[PDB]
């Protein structure tokens, strides 16, 4: 019963976690666009990578 309670919930938990990883990747890619354009410096681009990791 504990194994089935884990199986029924870890699907939604992993779906939420990999959607969080995808949103952090999109945020980092927008910060990389702002760095390549010229608006932001390297300190903020490096700050986004730590949240991604």
């Amino acid at each position: 019963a504990d194994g089935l309670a884990a199986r029924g919930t870890f699907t939604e938990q992993l779906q939420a976690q990999r959607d969080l990883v995808k949103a952090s990747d999109e945020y980092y890619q927008l910060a990389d666009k702002r760095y390549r354009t010229g608006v932001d410096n390297y300190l903020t681009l490096l700050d986004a990578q730590r949240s991604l990791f």
């Binding site: 927008l30 666009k33 702002r34 354009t37 010229g38 608006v39």
Partner: protein
């Protein structure tokens, strides 16, 4: 003074020179202020295409 007297001048021909030297200074100031905000507008136009 840049014209021969008693002659026929055209529309827009330069007649004198009134020693700019100050209008040159504030023209340089306005140009320097333009040259940063122009680059900022050109950068924000490239950034707004995908909502950065």
């Amino acid at each position: 003074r840049l014209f021969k007297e008693g002659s026929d001048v055209k529309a827009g021909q330069q007649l004198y020179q009134i020693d700019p030297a100050t209008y040159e200074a504030d023209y340089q100031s306005a140009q320097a202020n333009l040259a940063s905000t122009q680059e900022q507008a050109q950068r924000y136009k490239l950034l707004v295409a995908d909502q950065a």
